[PDB]
Amino acid sequence: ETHRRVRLLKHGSDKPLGFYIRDGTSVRVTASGLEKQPGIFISRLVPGGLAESTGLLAVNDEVIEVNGIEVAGKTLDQVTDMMVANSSNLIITVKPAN
């Protein structure tokens, strides 16, 4: 839509993904108009980790999907689990904070 597909492929690498995610509020479109709904956002990037090394992931970016699966409607424990499940070749789609 106006999103960035960022991939944290490891290819047999030790280097962790090294990022955190958190609960937030995102605004989405509806028949009622613009509504505040629960979202998932990037908390911070760990120095040395692959997430930082891309230069595309940034703090307060919204997680849209994880490897093709939209995270809307899902809790933070679920999304975390989706990401660590796919941790070898993780593909995040985000809406950049700016």
């Binding site: 962790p16 993904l17 090294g18 955190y20 958190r22 908390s43 933070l76 975390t80 990401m83 660590v84």
Partner: peptide, 9 residues
């Protein structure tokens, strides 16, 4: 806002 870590050492 509560947070959780994806693969952190």
């Amino acid at each position: 806002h509560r947070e959780m870590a994806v693969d952190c050492p």
